[PDB]
Amino acid sequence: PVEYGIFVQRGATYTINAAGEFEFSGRNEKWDQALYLSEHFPALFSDVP
Amino acid sequence: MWHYTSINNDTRVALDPKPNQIRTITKPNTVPQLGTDYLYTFNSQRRSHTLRLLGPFQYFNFSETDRGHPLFRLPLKYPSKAIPADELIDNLHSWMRSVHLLHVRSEDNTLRYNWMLGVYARSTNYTTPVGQLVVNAPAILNYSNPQDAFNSVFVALGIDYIDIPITNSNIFDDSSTPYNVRIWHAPTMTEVNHILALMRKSTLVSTHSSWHWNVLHTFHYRSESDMIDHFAAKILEDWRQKEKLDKGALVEADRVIQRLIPLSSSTYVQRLAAIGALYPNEFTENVLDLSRLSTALLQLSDTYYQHANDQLRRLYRRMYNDSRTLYMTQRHQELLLAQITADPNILLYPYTYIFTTIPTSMNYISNTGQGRIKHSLTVTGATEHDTVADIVLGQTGEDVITISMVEPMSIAVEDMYGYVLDTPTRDIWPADEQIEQKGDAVALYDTKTSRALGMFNNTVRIDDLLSPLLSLVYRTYIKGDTMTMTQGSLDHLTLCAAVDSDITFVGNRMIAPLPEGYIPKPMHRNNSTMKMLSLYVALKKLENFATNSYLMAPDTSIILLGAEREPAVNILRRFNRNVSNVRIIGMGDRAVEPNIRVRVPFPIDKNISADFIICDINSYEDQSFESMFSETISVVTTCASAATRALVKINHPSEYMINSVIERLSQLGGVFYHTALLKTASQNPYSYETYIYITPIAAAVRFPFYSNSAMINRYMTAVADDEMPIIPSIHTVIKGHSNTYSPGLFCGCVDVQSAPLALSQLKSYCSEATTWRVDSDDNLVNIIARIDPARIALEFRTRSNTSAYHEYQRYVPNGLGFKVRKTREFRYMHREVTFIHKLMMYALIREQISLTENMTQVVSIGGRNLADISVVPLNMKYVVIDPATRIETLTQEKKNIEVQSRPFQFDAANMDLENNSIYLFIAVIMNEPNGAATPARMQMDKIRNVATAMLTRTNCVAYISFYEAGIITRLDQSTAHKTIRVEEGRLKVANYVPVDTLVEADVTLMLRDIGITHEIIRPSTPELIDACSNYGIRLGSTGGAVLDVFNHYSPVIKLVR
Amino acid sequence: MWHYTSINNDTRVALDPKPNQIRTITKPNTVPQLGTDYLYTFNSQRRSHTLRLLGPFQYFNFSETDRGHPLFRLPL
Amino acid sequence: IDHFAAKILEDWRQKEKLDKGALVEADRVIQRLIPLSSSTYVQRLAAIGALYPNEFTENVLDLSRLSTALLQLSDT
Ligand SMILES: Nc1nc2c(ncn2[C@@H]2O[C@H](COP(=O)(O)OP(=O)(O)OP(=O)(O)O)[C@@H](O)[C@H]2O)c(=O)[nH]1
Ligand SMILES: Nc1ncnc2c1ncn2[C@@H]1O[C@H](COP(=O)(O)OP(=O)(O)OP(=O)(O)O)[C@@H](O)[C@H]1O
Ligand SMILES: Nc1ncnc2c1ncn2[C@@H]1O[C@H](COP(=O)(O)OP(=O)(O)OP(=O)(O)O)[C@@H](O)[C@H]1O
Ligand SMILES: C[S@@+](CC[C@H](N)C(=O)[O-])C[C@H]1O[C@@H](n2cnc3c(N)ncnc32)[C@H](O)[C@@H]1O
Ligand SMILES: C[S@@+](CC[C@H](N)C(=O)[O-])C[C@H]1O[C@@H](n2cnc3c(N)ncnc32)[C@H](O)[C@@H]1O
Ligand SMILES: [Mg+2]
Ligand SMILES: [Mg+2]
């Protein structure tokens, strides 16, 4: 739970920036597959420590 | 120094071992050593472990079998703290024992070992065709000519290339790699050109200007973002390298153009390629932020894409449209030539344009890293201004800037216990003087003292002024950090005032260590506590001046006559715990135990006596003046009768009250009471309350009455003000050259682009202005700037609005501050006492000058850096004759100020004083131009010459400041003078050389002999309040003690014609 | 000294941060420091723990999720 | 009642400082609460609160049970 709160405070998803940096949402939302073609990626798989 | 000097070498080839060193390259026998074999580090803020092998192992692919080792389990094992060095070493060692690269050692000395292919084969556990080739023919790894090492595996396998995964440098992270390095079988330049051309037909690939082992290699990126971060890191590497090459230093660059060449990439990578090749000046100035490097780089391209310069714009565009070409300076190109000369078959990237770099003259200031800039704004500059727009400053959160009321006073502890004296001067007290002084004291009592003085006295409390210091002594003592101090020492008394617990030395100069688990509460102190201590110290210094120990003598007593809780009685009782037999008791009408509760005068039955008394009686009740007078009289009478060394308070020290006290002591039978007025540094800085010091002496006291005493002037000159007190505003709108601002300070923030404009405008008001950004990411720059009356008095003399805007724009964006920590400004900044006395004298002379009609100019001789500018009205012309003054012909012409810049001659015939002129001689007569002290007879002589020289003049007004002799009599007996001194009978204010003082009687007598009009005036209390209210200054304690006796003994002669 | 001298200001408004300071207002990078970021105290006579955040956090509603954190399990 | 009491203490301390002529950074000039609808007792607190009785400055009241003393003060 604690690590979870720290992870999900960052955001459930992120977008790669044109400059290449990740930008996490800061929001806790359920993923939908409509998002798969969207700019967003699931944040579990960011591999950002 | 144009030509580059460099020694290019294939460092990566040099890293590859001889085949014979491969067996021991792990050093199986010995443990890996920190800083040589490995580089562990734990960043606690990031909670991220980072191990990094040195030597050949810096390039090392890991087999999943290698990743199954406990060494890599370690960071998970210690989520929050550093891996202990023992575990790191033992796991790193056992894993080193785990590795064994295939090799065939041979006796040829030309041979090397293909480290890359061997570690790769091992990492794939020899499953790839390269791993097969290596497991069957290890000898293929050995090589003489570096290139052939790969050609051998290209021919033998029949493949055109090999895709080697890259290594992460930090062996701990197992994250997927951004890209990977393909290696091509292209021995000739032609084969290389063809591969490059074909590479420009395919997605997301790039390559270096030249390659290691002279073998062509291409990076293939898994995404655009990976390509961007890679190109960025390389641009930083190339820029740093070129930055070093252009300094003419020899460099061991492994390659001449460190940056990557896109072969196919998106828009953004092409932009990075372009500004990268440009080598923009902005990098060298640190104008870019490297915290998010690529971002800034992209932004930089955006400027260059539309750059104000035509050459740089067209150059950037042209580079953007031919990204595949490798742009490089001529000076790089000659290095490429030297490289191709030393190694005729070296491969390097063939498509290459050679541009001449475009010079740019704009030297931006910049500094990433913490520290706010404290600008000193110039009054004027090359830039002109016309109707500048109002510059709004933003609201600032308390997260960034807090505005405390008064600056706490940093100070040495001993300085708290100082006091100043004022001895009586008059030999007689005429009855008409008694009626005059009584009328004065009654009129002054009936209508309350100045409201502004009350505001300052009630705002600048001594308790808060001392609080950070007294607590600090408590905090150190609580940690046991304090150790050595003498028994009677003032530091010891401060310690007793800081902690409630009794202290005890274990021996000479050594306090006892705290018992375990004991953390005694800080001593509770009211506002008068430290003052009462300082009065006790004063009596100790009065019984004999030379004493260092402050402990009371055995078999002696003291009384603190005014009492309540009276913490000082407890502190004093505990300070003297080691002295045998000593009474120490308070005795108020409100007194709580230990102190006896009793009224004064004492009941006729009760017997009260002591060797010392410290009265602090003060009736809270509003009352008739006659009752206040009779009560204070009876209090001084009983205080003097009861002790040989009374230290009575005088709440309303008019000349009448003090003189009535002297007359009353005169009336007591058979004893002659020597007396002196006194003021400790622990008093509230603004209080006019004064402590008379009564003692008996066998001799009758010549000159016992007071007249025009300093301590008395502090009170009597204060009177009810016509105006409301000047509350210090915080301004938020910087108008252009407006002159409407009430005293206070500008405070807020602006977009950093607008910052140079803001500093350009507030130069009109504030003399100096601290500024800072909070972070590299947030564009707003915070700015704080106290309003200087002197800068207003200078800048507003004329309507011209020049400034150094052109210089201030060299600051944006990194050149004007960084500070994450919240800053704390005060509405009342500390200033040394001499500075306050200067501002007071200026308020006196300025108010005096505004009254005079029809004067063409102010001639301030010895005016230094326009120090007297505040005094002169904006309309009339100002003149300076200080040799030390710097010349600024533009500032002088623009602001209406002549500067003679020559030593003023005091001989009367040579001297030429203009009519309708105000001649300031503020502290100039007491010194020679070179700064050596002028002997007092020469000072009275030059004052006499200024006097005789203006006798012919019709309308002229001299203001000759000087030092009266009486102060040396008073400072010899005082303690509170950290600034002022008395080295061999001469005053030594500030850092100035010691200087002999004039006697006022002989000076006035001489001026009467000359017959010129004269009036010895000194600045009073309202001038002090005006100075502090206008400049935003709080007085401070040592200043409060010394300012009365100092101000009174800097008379300002006012010659008038 | 009849007339009052005072500088009234909306201190509560001053406590509210610029939008840019909000990202780092937690100061994620560094540990909270006693007497600046927080004010812990234990009254042994009352046996009552008392933590009190400084800065903007002095005004801070807690989600039940925030109250589920071990920090709040500490006094027990 | 407890709220009005704490506010009365805040306003009284503030006014006690204002009447000394010291400059103050009061966030608001009259710190005490105004009932819009309350019971008898809160109206009593409102009244002695607004009075600024001398008894506070003398420390004649005990703050250990502030509202109680305040109620008693109104009774006098
Ligand atoms: N797996 C593996 N990769 C290597 C080895 N040597 C070099 N490389 C990789 O090959 C790439 C090309 O080599 P370089 O010309 O040195 O490129 P580079 O980016 O300047 O390398 P750096 O020294 O880290 O800056 C680099 O990114 C390295 O990561 C090796 O021995 N093993
Ligand atoms: N820094 C640049 N360098 C070269 N060309 C650019 C640059 N910025 C924009 N362009 C040109 O403009 C087009 C992009 O338009 P635009 O600038 O509106 O959006 P963008 O790609 O997000 O760039 P920016 O971030 O500058 O807005 C590209 O096709 C490119 O040719
Ligand atoms: N302190 C007071 N201030 C104003 N009115 C009061 C006060 N005390 C009593 N009263 C008036 O008297 C009535 C209450 O009667 P009484 O005083 O006998 O009992 P109470 O409410 O407990 O007050 P107390 O505690 O003074 O006895 C109320 O309706 C009120 O109008
Ligand atoms: C300004 S206070 C300072 C006392 C002491 N320094 C302290 O604060 O602990 C002076 C006290 O003396 C008391 N006092 C006033 N007039 C007195 C008198 N005539 N005789 C005895 N005590 C008196 C008052 O009650 C007042 O509390
Ligand atoms: C104490 S400083 C300035 C004091 C005061 N703040 C003011 O501006 O008048 C006095 C200056 O006067 C200059 N000075 C001293 N003797 C002088 C002389 N005989 N003629 C002209 N300037 C003199 C010195 O250079 C010195 O810097
Ligand atoms: Mg390299
Ligand atoms: Mg509030």
PDB file of N, CA, C and O in Angstrom, chain B residues 965-1011:
ATOM      1  N   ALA B 965      35.201  67.343  23.799  1.00  0.00           N
ATOM      2  CA  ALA B 965      36.150  66.655  24.682  1.00  0.00           C
ATOM      3  C   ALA B 965      35.499  65.801  25.771  1.00  0.00           C
ATOM      4  O   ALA B 965      36.048  64.768  26.177  1.00  0.00           O
ATOM      5  N   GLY B 966      34.308  66.201  26.205  1.00  0.00           N
ATOM      6  CA  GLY B 966      33.691  65.600  27.373  1.00  0.00           C
ATOM      7  C   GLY B 966      33.443  64.117  27.192  1.00  0.00           C
ATOM      8  O   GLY B 966      33.460  63.358  28.164  1.00  0.00           O
ATOM      9  N   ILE B 967      33.260  63.695  25.944  1.00  0.00           N
ATOM     10  CA  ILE B 967      32.984  62.295  25.662  1.00  0.00           C
ATOM     11  C   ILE B 967      34.130  61.394  26.122  1.00  0.00           C
ATOM     12  O   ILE B 967      33.885  60.288  26.610  1.00  0.00           O
ATOM     13  N   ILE B 968      35.371  61.869  26.019  1.00  0.00           N
ATOM     14  CA  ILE B 968      36.488  61.030  26.445  1.00  0.00           C
ATOM     15  C   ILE B 968      36.449  60.816  27.955  1.00  0.00           C
ATOM     16  O   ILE B 968      36.898  59.782  28.450  1.00  0.00           O
ATOM     17  N   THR B 969      35.907  61.790  28.681  1.00  0.00           N
ATOM     18  CA  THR B 969      35.732  61.634  30.120  1.00  0.00           C
ATOM     19  C   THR B 969      34.698  60.553  30.399  1.00  0.00           C
ATOM     20  O   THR B 969      34.831  59.780  31.348  1.00  0.00           O
ATOM     21  N   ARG B 970      33.684  60.482  29.542  1.00  0.00           N
ATOM     22  CA  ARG B 970      32.560  59.580  29.776  1.00  0.00           C
ATOM     23  C   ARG B 970      32.806  58.161  29.275  1.00  0.00           C
ATOM     24  O   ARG B 970      32.372  57.194  29.900  1.00  0.00           O
ATOM     25  N   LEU B 971      33.489  58.038  28.143  1.00  0.00           N
ATOM     26  CA  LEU B 971      33.821  56.724  27.600  1.00  0.00           C
ATOM     27  C   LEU B 971      34.918  56.001  28.380  1.00  0.00           C
ATOM     28  O   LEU B 971      35.022  54.778  28.320  1.00  0.00           O
ATOM     29  N   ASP B 972      35.743  56.757  29.099  1.00  0.00           N
ATOM     30  CA  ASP B 972      36.754  56.145  29.955  1.00  0.00           C
ATOM     31  C   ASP B 972      36.092  55.398  31.112  1.00  0.00           C
ATOM     32  O   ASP B 972      36.650  54.443  31.651  1.00  0.00           O
ATOM     33  N   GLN B 973      34.898  55.849  31.485  1.00  0.00           N
ATOM     34  CA  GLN B 973      34.159  55.267  32.599  1.00  0.00           C
ATOM     35  C   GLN B 973      33.090  54.263  32.165  1.00  0.00           C
ATOM     36  O   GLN B 973      32.506  53.572  32.997  1.00  0.00           O
ATOM     37  N   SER B 974      32.825  54.197  30.865  1.00  0.00           N
ATOM     38  CA  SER B 974      31.785  53.318  30.332  1.00  0.00           C
ATOM     39  C   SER B 974      32.341  51.986  29.818  1.00  0.00           C
ATOM     40  O   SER B 974      33.557  51.785  29.779  1.00  0.00           O
ATOM     41  N   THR B 975      31.440  51.076  29.452  1.00  0.00           N
ATOM     42  CA  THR B 975      31.825  49.767  28.927  1.00  0.00           C
ATOM     43  C   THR B 975      31.234  49.491  27.538  1.00  0.00           C
ATOM     44  O   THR B 975      31.858  48.828  26.711  1.00  0.00           O
ATOM     45  N   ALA B 976      30.033  50.006  27.285  1.00  0.00           N
ATOM     46  CA  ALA B 976      29.313  49.707  26.045  1.00  0.00           C
ATOM     47  C   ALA B 976      29.781  50.548  24.870  1.00  0.00           C
ATOM     48  O   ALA B 976      29.089  51.472  24.444  1.00  0.00           O
ATOM     49  N   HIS B 977      30.952  50.222  24.339  1.00  0.00           N
ATOM     50  CA  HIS B 977      31.441  50.892  23.145  1.00  0.00           C
ATOM     51  C   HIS B 977      32.223  49.924  22.262  1.00  0.00           C
ATOM     52  O   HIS B 977      33.453  49.955  22.216  1.00  0.00           O
ATOM     53  N   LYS B 978      31.495  49.038  21.591  1.00  0.00           N
ATOM     54  CA  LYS B 978      32.107  48.099  20.659  1.00  0.00           C
ATOM     55  C   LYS B 978      32.690  48.813  19.437  1.00  0.00           C
ATOM     56  O   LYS B 978      33.674  48.357  18.850  1.00  0.00           O
ATOM     57  N   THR B 979      32.084  49.938  19.069  1.00  0.00           N
ATOM     58  CA  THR B 979      32.525  50.707  17.909  1.00  0.00           C
ATOM     59  C   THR B 979      33.446  51.852  18.315  1.00  0.00           C
ATOM     60  O   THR B 979      34.606  51.896  17.912  1.00  0.00           O
ATOM     61  N   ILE B 980      32.917  52.776  19.113  1.00  0.00           N
ATOM     62  CA  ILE B 980      33.684  53.912  19.623  1.00  0.00           C
ATOM     63  C   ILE B 980      34.722  53.450  20.645  1.00  0.00           C
ATOM     64  O   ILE B 980      34.503  52.471  21.355  1.00  0.00           O
ATOM     65  N   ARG B 981      35.854  54.145  20.722  1.00  0.00           N
ATOM     66  CA  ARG B 981      36.913  53.772  21.663  1.00  0.00           C
ATOM     67  C   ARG B 981      37.569  54.998  22.282  1.00  0.00           C
ATOM     68  O   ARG B 981      37.063  56.112  22.150  1.00  0.00           O
ATOM     69  N   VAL B 982      38.685  54.781  22.975  1.00  0.00           N
ATOM     70  CA  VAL B 982      39.486  55.879  23.518  1.00  0.00           C
ATOM     71  C   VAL B 982      40.965  55.511  23.620  1.00  0.00           C
ATOM     72  O   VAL B 982      41.489  55.335  24.717  1.00  0.00           O
ATOM     73  N   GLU B 983      41.637  55.407  22.477  1.00  0.00           N
ATOM     74  CA  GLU B 983      43.056  55.047  22.466  1.00  0.00           C
ATOM     75  C   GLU B 983      43.954  56.243  22.783  1.00  0.00           C
ATOM     76  O   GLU B 983      44.204  57.088  21.922  1.00  0.00           O
ATOM     77  N   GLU B 984      44.436  56.289  24.024  1.00  0.00           N
ATOM     78  CA  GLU B 984      45.316  57.353  24.512  1.00  0.00           C
ATOM     79  C   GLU B 984      44.695  58.754  24.418  1.00  0.00           C
ATOM     80  O   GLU B 984      45.313  59.692  23.912  1.00  0.00           O
ATOM     81  N   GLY B 985      43.461  58.882  24.894  1.00  0.00           N
ATOM     82  CA  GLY B 985      42.820  60.182  25.012  1.00  0.00           C
ATOM     83  C   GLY B 985      42.158  60.704  23.748  1.00  0.00           C
ATOM     84  O   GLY B 985      41.607  61.806  23.741  1.00  0.00           O
ATOM     85  N   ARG B 986      42.211  59.921  22.676  1.00  0.00           N
ATOM     86  CA  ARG B 986      41.588  60.317  21.420  1.00  0.00           C
ATOM     87  C   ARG B 986      40.436  59.391  21.039  1.00  0.00           C
ATOM     88  O   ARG B 986      40.502  58.182  21.262  1.00  0.00           O
ATOM     89  N   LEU B 987      39.384  59.965  20.461  1.00  0.00           N
ATOM     90  CA  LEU B 987      38.270  59.176  19.950  1.00  0.00           C
ATOM     91  C   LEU B 987      38.726  58.304  18.795  1.00  0.00           C
ATOM     92  O   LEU B 987      39.549  58.720  17.985  1.00  0.00           O
ATOM     93  N   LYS B 988      38.186  57.095  18.717  1.00  0.00           N
ATOM     94  CA  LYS B 988      38.508  56.198  17.618  1.00  0.00           C
ATOM     95  C   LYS B 988      37.241  55.548  17.069  1.00  0.00           C
ATOM     96  O   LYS B 988      37.072  54.333  17.154  1.00  0.00           O
ATOM     97  N   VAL B 989      36.345  56.362  16.518  1.00  0.00           N
ATOM     98  CA  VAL B 989      35.096  55.845  15.962  1.00  0.00           C
ATOM     99  C   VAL B 989      35.352  54.943  14.756  1.00  0.00           C
ATOM    100  O   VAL B 989      36.256  55.204  13.958  1.00  0.00           O
ATOM    101  N   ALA B 990      34.562  53.876  14.647  1.00  0.00           N
ATOM    102  CA  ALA B 990      34.654  52.926  13.538  1.00  0.00           C
ATOM    103  C   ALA B 990      36.085  52.449  13.278  1.00  0.00           C
ATOM    104  O   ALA B 990      36.826  52.143  14.214  1.00  0.00           O
ATOM    105  N   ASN B 991      36.459  52.387  12.002  1.00  0.00           N
ATOM    106  CA  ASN B 991      37.814  52.009  11.601  1.00  0.00           C
ATOM    107  C   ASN B 991      38.771  53.194  11.462  1.00  0.00           C
ATOM    108  O   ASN B 991      39.949  53.016  11.147  1.00  0.00           O
ATOM    109  N   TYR B 992      38.257  54.397  11.697  1.00  0.00           N
ATOM    110  CA  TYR B 992      39.035  55.626  11.555  1.00  0.00           C
ATOM    111  C   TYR B 992      40.186  55.721  12.555  1.00  0.00           C
ATOM    112  O   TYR B 992      40.135  55.139  13.640  1.00  0.00           O
ATOM    113  N   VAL B 993      41.224  56.454  12.169  1.00  0.00           N
ATOM    114  CA  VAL B 993      42.391  56.675  13.015  1.00  0.00           C
ATOM    115  C   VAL B 993      41.963  57.484  14.253  1.00  0.00           C
ATOM    116  O   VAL B 993      41.011  58.268  14.181  1.00  0.00           O
ATOM    117  N   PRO B 994      42.624  57.263  15.407  1.00  0.00           N
ATOM    118  CA  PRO B 994      42.263  58.039  16.602  1.00  0.00           C
ATOM    119  C   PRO B 994      42.473  59.536  16.395  1.00  0.00           C
ATOM    120  O   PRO B 994      43.450  59.926  15.760  1.00  0.00           O
ATOM    121  N   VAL B 995      41.589  60.360  16.949  1.00  0.00           N
ATOM    122  CA  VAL B 995      41.607  61.796  16.677  1.00  0.00           C
ATOM    123  C   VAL B 995      41.238  62.644  17.899  1.00  0.00           C
ATOM    124  O   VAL B 995      40.200  62.429  18.529  1.00  0.00           O
ATOM    125  N   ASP B 996      42.092  63.615  18.218  1.00  0.00           N
ATOM    126  CA  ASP B 996      41.893  64.484  19.380  1.00  0.00           C
ATOM    127  C   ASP B 996      40.650  65.375  19.272  1.00  0.00           C
ATOM    128  O   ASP B 996      40.264  65.799  18.181  1.00  0.00           O
ATOM    129  N   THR B 997      40.030  65.642  20.418  1.00  0.00           N
ATOM    130  CA  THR B 997      38.739  66.322  20.473  1.00  0.00           C
ATOM    131  C   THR B 997      38.808  67.774  20.968  1.00  0.00           C
ATOM    132  O   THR B 997      39.599  68.103  21.854  1.00  0.00           O
ATOM    133  N   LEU B 998      37.978  68.637  20.381  1.00  0.00           N
ATOM    134  CA  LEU B 998      37.845  70.031  20.811  1.00  0.00           C
ATOM    135  C   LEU B 998      37.012  70.174  22.083  1.00  0.00           C
ATOM    136  O   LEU B 998      36.122  69.367  22.339  1.00  0.00           O
ATOM    137  N   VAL B 999      37.296  71.207  22.870  1.00  0.00           N
ATOM    138  CA  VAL B 999      36.438  71.568  23.994  1.00  0.00           C
ATOM    139  C   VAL B 999      35.423  72.628  23.552  1.00  0.00           C
ATOM    140  O   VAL B 999      35.795  73.623  22.931  1.00  0.00           O
ATOM    141  N   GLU B1000      34.147  72.411  23.870  1.00  0.00           N
ATOM    142  CA  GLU B1000      33.073  73.287  23.395  1.00  0.00           C
ATOM    143  C   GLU B1000      33.184  74.721  23.903  1.00  0.00           C
ATOM    144  O   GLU B1000      32.860  75.671  23.183  1.00  0.00           O
ATOM    145  N   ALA B1001      33.663  74.875  25.134  1.00  0.00           N
ATOM    146  CA  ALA B1001      33.740  76.191  25.757  1.00  0.00           C
ATOM    147  C   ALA B1001      34.704  77.102  25.005  1.00  0.00           C
ATOM    148  O   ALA B1001      34.367  78.240  24.681  1.00  0.00           O
ATOM    149  N   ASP B1002      35.897  76.588  24.716  1.00  0.00           N
ATOM    150  CA  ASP B1002      36.899  77.351  23.980  1.00  0.00           C
ATOM    151  C   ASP B1002      36.483  77.622  22.532  1.00  0.00           C
ATOM    152  O   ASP B1002      36.840  78.656  21.963  1.00  0.00           O
ATOM    153  N   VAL B1003      35.719  76.704  21.943  1.00  0.00           N
ATOM    154  CA  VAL B1003      35.239  76.879  20.573  1.00  0.00           C
ATOM    155  C   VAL B1003      34.211  78.004  20.495  1.00  0.00           C
ATOM    156  O   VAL B1003      34.312  78.898  19.649  1.00  0.00           O
ATOM    157  N   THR B1004      33.228  77.963  21.390  1.00  0.00           N
ATOM    158  CA  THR B1004      32.214  79.008  21.440  1.00  0.00           C
ATOM    159  C   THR B1004      32.831  80.354  21.829  1.00  0.00           C
ATOM    160  O   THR B1004      32.422  81.404  21.330  1.00  0.00           O
ATOM    161  N   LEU B1005      33.836  80.314  22.699  1.00  0.00           N
ATOM    162  CA  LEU B1005      34.533  81.525  23.121  1.00  0.00           C
ATOM    163  C   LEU B1005      35.277  82.136  21.936  1.00  0.00           C
ATOM    164  O   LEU B1005      35.281  83.358  21.745  1.00  0.00           O
ATOM    165  N   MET B1006      35.878  81.273  21.122  1.00  0.00           N
ATOM    166  CA  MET B1006      36.594  81.724  19.938  1.00  0.00           C
ATOM    167  C   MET B1006      35.641  82.318  18.908  1.00  0.00           C
ATOM    168  O   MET B1006      35.943  83.340  18.293  1.00  0.00           O
ATOM    169  N   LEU B1007      34.486  81.680  18.726  1.00  0.00           N
ATOM    170  CA  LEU B1007      33.487  82.197  17.795  1.00  0.00           C
ATOM    171  C   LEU B1007      32.885  83.524  18.261  1.00  0.00           C
ATOM    172  O   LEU B1007      32.525  84.364  17.437  1.00  0.00           O
ATOM    173  N   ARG B1008      32.762  83.707  19.574  1.00  0.00           N
ATOM    174  CA  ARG B1008      32.364  85.009  20.110  1.00  0.00           C
ATOM    175  C   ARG B1008      33.452  86.050  19.862  1.00  0.00           C
ATOM    176  O   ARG B1008      33.160  87.221  19.614  1.00  0.00           O
ATOM    177  N   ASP B1009      34.710  85.615  19.937  1.00  0.00           N
ATOM    178  CA  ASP B1009      35.837  86.498  19.641  1.00  0.00           C
ATOM    179  C   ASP B1009      35.888  86.907  18.162  1.00  0.00           C
ATOM    180  O   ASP B1009      36.346  88.000  17.828  1.00  0.00           O
ATOM    181  N   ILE B1010      35.419  86.022  17.284  1.00  0.00           N
ATOM    182  CA  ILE B1010      35.317  86.328  15.856  1.00  0.00           C
ATOM    183  C   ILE B1010      34.099  87.211  15.559  1.00  0.00           C
ATOM    184  O   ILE B1010      34.111  88.023  14.632  1.00  0.00           O
ATOM    185  N   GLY B1011      33.055  87.058  16.367  1.00  0.00           N
ATOM    186  CA  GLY B1011      31.862  87.879  16.246  1.00  0.00           C
ATOM    187  C   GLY B1011      30.850  87.383  15.229  1.00  0.00           C
ATOM    188  O   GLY B1011      29.792  87.988  15.049  1.00  0.00           O
TER     189      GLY B1011
END
